[PDB]
Design a protein around this ligand. Structure first.
Ligand SMILES: O=C(Cc1cccc(Cl)c1)Nc1cncc2ccncc12
Ligand SMILES: O=C(Cc1cccc(Cl)c1)Nc1cncc2ccncc12
Lengths: 304, 304
């Protein structure tokens, strides 16, 4: 029993982290096969970060201007190219520690582990979610750019995120491993609107199933609801609307506990209308939305 | 900015995990140099777990009865011995992936990362604290025994915990890497008293400094207090008493924010007497005690 904000073991990603220096700027890079992926703002100085013409700034750069260091040893850059907001540095050596991997673009509401890095060295690992407004609520300091988000299926690491920017609101924006920012964000030093951030309803429901599984059952009530009635309540409280796809993914958890999905929605509705009344659920005093139904199943089953 | 329940990168521990089978029981082992450490209840069947005479049960075991598998390859056991509640299996090969390491016994209130494992394979990593009643609030399923808790200083892994048991209350009990259980717990299938669990006052104060550092400052007030006055409030609310050693360790955070330690105690006092009033602090609706003052400094500085 017990429920934790658990991250994937970070070892397979640790062996891919390198440090990339260009001019006076140093950030993290991701070494896979013979290619190092890093954010393209590595070619920038604070002066041109106000409105950078990346194509023009890259024209002044050569393969020898990109310094790629793996641990303590230097990699030789034999090629460079820009793909959207990331730079791809071809190196002359394939990373001996490249794991099985995929580059995936996650949907909002999905979760992932982040391996925070400074100077190509890892500092820590944590679990987080892609918010409905396409920001991540991370923990990142200057020099954390290039840190990646990922998921792991058995032996295959699915890279989903690469950190780029911190908004004035202390929230984080970044790209998939093809260089496309999640959301409206651009890699510029301008104030950018994050957008309204809703609560991920399917994840709070999944977390509520995990609470029942691990002993916390005070919030269970004698009521049921319909998808349309529940969605009226979700609208008022800035929760994402629940659809039949959401109910379908909550099938395994509904089957494990024997609480119908709509019966659990009625518990959610009453917790939203009445609050927790000073009580807790899995050691939290608020409704947690950063565990997907897959995460709860995996944590309560023990997938390695 | 941002504050996360961050764990150490788990790679150095991943390369030490093995699977140990003895009879019909399989649990995790920790392979360091030529020795595999695992919980001694590996020699037990559910029948003798009611009151096992471990010395007598080990007499019926030989080096060939302990099956140690590293990934997919078998290790040859050339020696075995019992040290307190752990078994030390000498193997004929030194783990090529043994990192720099120490075996340390942590104090209650201190935190550590856990690499949860099933069948010698890692499932996830999470941050947790040794509770004042010597239990850990983990997330563990059957077969997680042998999973280790650790800290990392630059390149040296300090192993502090090895998981053994889950109490009827869903809380976890375990040992240091010398086989000594933290707390009164024995490795038997009997109901055991966890004890009163207080809140780690120095850690909530450190977390409150982290909140100020990362923008959350609503809880700051126009008051101060004394150590004796604050301790009266801590007593009422089951918080550990604050001592001058606690105030000394909160020096760096007091110096970083400019809020005197006793001034921050006065904020803690008012949050304890008045609650959060529906507000949050670092995305939490309760006072978090699982970040030490060292953890806050490291997270807000970027130690790798
Ligand atoms: O914000 C930036 C640099 C940047 C500025 C403008 C556009 C881009 Cl694409 C990148 N990176 C950082 C990441 N995470 C956290 C931070 C904390 C402190 N300072 C900087 C941080
Ligand atoms: O409780 C036990 C076995 C045990 C029984 C009595 C004494 C000892 Cl030293 C060990 N180990 C488990 C660890 N963590 C979580 C669990 C979850 C489910 N089943 C079992 C768990």
């Amino acid at each position: 029993s017990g429920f934790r904000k658990m991250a994937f073991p970070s070892g397979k990603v640790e062996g891919c982290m390198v440090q990339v220096t260009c001019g006076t700027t140093t950030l993290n890079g991701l070494w896979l096969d013979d290619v190092v992926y890093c954010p393209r703002h590595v070619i920038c100085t604070s002066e041109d970060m106000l409105n950078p013409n990346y194509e023009d700034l890259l024209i002044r750069k050569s393969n020898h201007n990109f310094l790629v260091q793996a641990g303590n040893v230097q990699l030789r850059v034999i090629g460079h190219s820009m793909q959207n907001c990331v730079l791809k540095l071809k190196v002359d050596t394939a990373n001996p520690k490249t794991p099985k991997y995929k580059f995936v673009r996650i949907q909002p509401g999905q979760t992932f582990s982040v391996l925070a890095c400074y100077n190509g060295s890892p500092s820590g690992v944590y679990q987080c979610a892609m918010r409905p407004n396409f920001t991540i609520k991370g923990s990142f300091l200057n020099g954390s750019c290039g840190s990646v988000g990922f998921n792991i299926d058995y032996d295959c690491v699915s890279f989903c995120y690469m950190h780029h920017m911190e908004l004035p609101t202390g929230v984080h924006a970044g790209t998939d491993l093809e260089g496309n920012f999640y959301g409206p964000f651009v890699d510029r030093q301008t104030a950018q609107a994050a957008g309204t951030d809703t609560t991920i309803t399917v994840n709070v429901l999944a977390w509520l199933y995990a609470a029942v599984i691990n002993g916390d059952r005070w919030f269970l009530n004698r009521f049921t609801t319909t998808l349309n009635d529940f969605n009226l309540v979700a609208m008022k409280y800035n929760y994402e609307p629940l659809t039949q796809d959401h109910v379908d993914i909550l099938g395994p958890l509904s089957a494990q506990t024997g609480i119908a999905v709509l019966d659990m929605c009625a518990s959610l509705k009453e917790l939203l209308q009445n609050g927790m009344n000073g009580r807790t659920i899995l050691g939290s005093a608020l409704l947690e939305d950063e565990f997907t139904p897959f995460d709860v199943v995996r944590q309560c089953s023990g997938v390695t």
